[PDB]
Amino acid sequence: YPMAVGLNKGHKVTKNVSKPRHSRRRGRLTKHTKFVRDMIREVCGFAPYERRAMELLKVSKDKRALKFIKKRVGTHIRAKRKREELSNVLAAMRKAA
Amino acid sequence: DRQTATQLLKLAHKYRPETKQEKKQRLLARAEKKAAGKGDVPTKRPPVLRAGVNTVTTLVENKKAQLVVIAHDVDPIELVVFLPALCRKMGVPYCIIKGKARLGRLVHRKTCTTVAF
Amino acid sequence: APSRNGMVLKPHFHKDWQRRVATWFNQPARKIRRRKARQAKARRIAPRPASGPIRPIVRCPTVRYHTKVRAGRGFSLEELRVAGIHKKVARTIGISVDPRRRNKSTESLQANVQRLKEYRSKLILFPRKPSAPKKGDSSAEELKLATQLTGPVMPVRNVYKKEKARVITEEEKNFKAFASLRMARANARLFGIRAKRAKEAAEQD
Amino acid sequence: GAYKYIQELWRKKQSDVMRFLLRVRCWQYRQLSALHRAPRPTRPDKARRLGYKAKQGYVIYRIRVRRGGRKRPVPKGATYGKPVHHGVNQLKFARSLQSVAEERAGRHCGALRVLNSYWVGEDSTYKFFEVILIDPFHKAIRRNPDTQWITKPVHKHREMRGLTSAGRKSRGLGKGHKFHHTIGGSRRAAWRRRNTLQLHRYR
RNA sequence: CGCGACCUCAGAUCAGACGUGGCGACCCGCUGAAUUUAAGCAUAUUAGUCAGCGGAGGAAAAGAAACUAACCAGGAUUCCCUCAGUAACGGCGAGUGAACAGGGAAGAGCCCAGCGCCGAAUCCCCGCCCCGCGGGGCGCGGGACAUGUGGCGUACGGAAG
RNA sequence: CGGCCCCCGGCGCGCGCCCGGGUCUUCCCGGAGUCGGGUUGCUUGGGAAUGCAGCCCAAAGCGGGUGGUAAACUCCAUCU
Numbered sequence A: 001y002p003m004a005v006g007l008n009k010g011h012k013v014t015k016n017v018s019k020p021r022h023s024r025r026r027g028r029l030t031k032h033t034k035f036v037r038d039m040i041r042e043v044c045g046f047a048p049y050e051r052r053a054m055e056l057l058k059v060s061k062d063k064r065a066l067k068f069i070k071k072r073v074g075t076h077i078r079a080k081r082k083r084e085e086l087s088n089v090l091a092a093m094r095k096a097a
Numbered sequence B: 001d002r003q004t005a006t007q008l009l010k011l012a013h014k015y016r017p018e019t020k021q022e023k024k025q026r027l028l029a030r031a032e033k034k035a036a037g038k039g040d041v042p043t044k045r046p047p048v049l050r051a052g053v054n055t056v057t058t059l060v061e062n063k064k065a066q067l068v069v070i071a072h073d074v075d076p077i078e079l080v081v082f083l084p085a086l087c088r089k090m091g092v093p094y095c096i097i098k099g100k101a102r103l104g105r106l107v108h109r110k111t112c113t114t115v116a117f
Numbered sequence C: 001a002p003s004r005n006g007m008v009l010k011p012h013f014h015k016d017w018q019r020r021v022a023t024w025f026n027q028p029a030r031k032i033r034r035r036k037a038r039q040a041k042a043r044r045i046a047p048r049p050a051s052g053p054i055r056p057i058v059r060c061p062t063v064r065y066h067t068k069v070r071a072g073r074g075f076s077l078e079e080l081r082v083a084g085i086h087k088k089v090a091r092t093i094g095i096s097v098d099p100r101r102r103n104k105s106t107e108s109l110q111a112n113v114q115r116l117k118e119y120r121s122k123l124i125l126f127p128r129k130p131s132a133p134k135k136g137d138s139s140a141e142e143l144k145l146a147t148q149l150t151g152p153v154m155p156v157r158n159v160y161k162k163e164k165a166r167v168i169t170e171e172e173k174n175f176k177a178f179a180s181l182r183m184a185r186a187n188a189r190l191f192g193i194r195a196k197r198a199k200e201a202a203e204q205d
Numbered sequence D: 001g002a003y004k005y006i007q008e009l010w011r012k013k014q015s016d017v018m019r020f021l022l023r024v025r026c027w028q029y030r031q032l033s034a035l036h037r038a039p040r041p042t043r044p045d046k047a048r049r050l051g052y053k054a055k056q057g058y059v060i061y062r063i064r065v066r067r068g069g070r071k072r073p074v075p076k077g078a079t080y081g082k083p084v085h086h087g088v089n090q091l092k093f094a095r096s097l098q099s100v101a102e103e104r105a106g107r108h109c110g111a112l113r114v115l116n117s118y119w120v121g122e123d124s125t126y127k128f129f130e131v132i133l134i135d136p137f138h139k140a141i142r143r144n145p146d147t148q149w150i151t152k153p154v155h156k157h158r159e160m161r162g163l164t165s166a167g168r169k170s171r172g173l174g175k176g177h178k179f180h181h182t183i184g185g186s187r188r189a190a191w192r193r194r195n196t197l198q199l200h201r202y203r
Numbered sequence E: 001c002g003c004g005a006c007c008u009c010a011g012a013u014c015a016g017a018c019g020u021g022g023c024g025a026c027c028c029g030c031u032g033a034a035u036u037u038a039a040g041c042a043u044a045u046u047a048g049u050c051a052g053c054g055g056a057g058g059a060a061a062a063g064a065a066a067c068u069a070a071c072c073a074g075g076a077u078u079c080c081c082u083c084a085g086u087a088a089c090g091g092c093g094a095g096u097g098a099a100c101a102g103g104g105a106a107g108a109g110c111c112c113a114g115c116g117c118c119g120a121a122u123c124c125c126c127g128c129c130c131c132g133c134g135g136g137g138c139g140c141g142g143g144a145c146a147u148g149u150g151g152c153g154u155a156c157g158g159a160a161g
Numbered sequence F: 001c002g003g004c005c006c007c008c009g010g011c012g013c014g015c016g017c018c019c020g021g022g023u024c025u026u027c028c029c030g031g032a033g034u035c036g037g038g039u040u041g042c043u044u045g046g047g048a049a050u051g052c053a054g055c056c057c058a059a060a061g062c063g064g065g066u067g068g069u070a071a072a073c074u075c076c077a078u079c080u
């Protein structure tokens, strides 16, 4: 009982189940590439905006810690991923003692 | 120090890479044994030191290197600065020798910045 | 400056429009010019069909135009997979290839696989020297012509179904109403709101 | 796999290992002259991903551009028009400073064809760009058909037409709904074609 | 003290090449008004046009999606007819103003850095010759480039073993 | 329509260059003072900012851009 309006719209077809395009799996982790970033961050270190963040992130609050990263890293969807990986290195420093 | 560098550059001297002179006559002596014997495998492995940072770093991270000699006065340091931290994790023993041009004379070139057994 | 009952007009001539005027005086002379460029090209590719490769069947996107069928850019690289001809051999035999094309319907897929096997059906290749891999005899009694026109297999063929005559049966003449559309439209615009009201009712405890 | 480490070590330049040597050379670039021939790329990672190779016929200059916007070159700041054009001192010059670096590197060397350029430093007054040049009549560039496009006479002076990577970013071109102020070719070929009067022959 | 290797640099009427200047109708990059209109006049309009400056080429620029879409989906660029004087902008005044569908003209696709593999397997210059016109190629021999990475296969539509 | 001289596009002897496809398995896989954000000035029909630029801040890797009303959650589309 088809109809162009509602909740199951349109002319009904049957979907062609296929492999994704190779370009669409693009920004992936690929463990050799993960090795290069993770080895170099101990010979390079931490930026000064993300050391002042993690002295706020280990004692005081997380609401001033995300608001701080909001002012220095642009958006909100960027400033939580940064807030949650500074905190996972912070537990690999603190709780892994 | 200069005693340890000399014991090292002596051992790196008889593992010198192939110059173009002997490359000419190794391919003459290869064809004249195919004209003689037609062997399946004349040499099991020809031993040599690999030179070059993009060559060395592939060998360090596969742990196929024995000893990585790394230079001293490389003009941008960022070409080289990772590799002492990289040899420590992979378990390859590394050493800093004075002068990028002195181990570049092992390889018949001007500078070569890294050699590795 | 205006007068009695007329239009209120906005003529776009407040700019130096007389240096940018285009007069189509050469437009006869460019039509016979681009005819000669078709003729001098048709004999340069002399046995090959004029207007080039075979194009795929393509349905137009919008609510306005999705009832019709259009020639496309090329085949999706999965038709050539399923029809079984290589993608770097497809364009040298005369098949337009578009590698950025997706087929997310099986119906639209198999119509261009069938279109492509029907092309390879009525295709005759020419050897360099007569060795003929995957090829037979003399050129189909000398191929009945030399060059085709305005399409290999006439790309539109926008056909419609027969559906001869039915008897108006019960519950076909009863249910499927205008109220089927108005109940469907309110179920679209109240679906997200009601599922919020289900969460509020379950947290009563 | 060394150039993967040179790249990721460069993408962290607020770290104290990296901001040390990035201003021990910004000191050293400021003691030299305006345009100066480098003997080699100071960063061989970014150089060769922009088209550099280590062969006879590629040549690198670092040139220095003074930072900031433009002041309107008008005597005593008086522009004499309607008030919307009193803009002496807040104006910004819609071409980027890297494209200014590619230009006067290629303006000094007229026998050279400029490929593109990259960033190597800035302090407060100056900004530093290594500009990579191609000598079109060297027989290592005149041969090798991977490079013979630039020894062809329509590729003369690609910055005075804005055809490099830094040049074409100011032209605002691109495919998409954000970029059809230039929907045929360029900004003033879209302009001429929407603002011409196409009065036909049977009209 | 000296010798040497490099690294950064200088000099030469060094060997061999290249750039300059003209035209500028059309094309590209900048820069840029005011007359005028609003019945005055400031934003606006004129107009991103005139004038100024720099680069080309027989065409140039653009060009193989960090696209459009929202449905049974289309599929690089440029051009034409339409969309359209339309959505939109505007002392919402005077005025300004695109795009996607659709139909055509033409149609063509590709390359590298990276990622690893290959004994740098690559290139330039000079010396004489096999063979040559109207000269540039494979070969024979040193001096260079180059491991801070030449060449082979390799490209996101996947690739390699 | 002929006859005269000159200049071209492609037959066929000698160089030179020569493994392609399919399935399965294993492994590899990407451009940073850039994206983005804040502010400023110009530009646009682009309107809670279309584009461009200066300045300050400055990324990620199941990531990023876009989806034409700023914003948070979520699913999905699409490109790289």
Ligand SMILES: [Mg+2]
Binding pocket: none
């Ligand atoms: Mg040199």
Ligand SMILES: [Mg+2]
Binding pocket: D080
């Ligand atoms: Mg005046």
Ligand SMILES: [Mg+2]
Binding pocket: D203
């Ligand atoms: Mg009429």
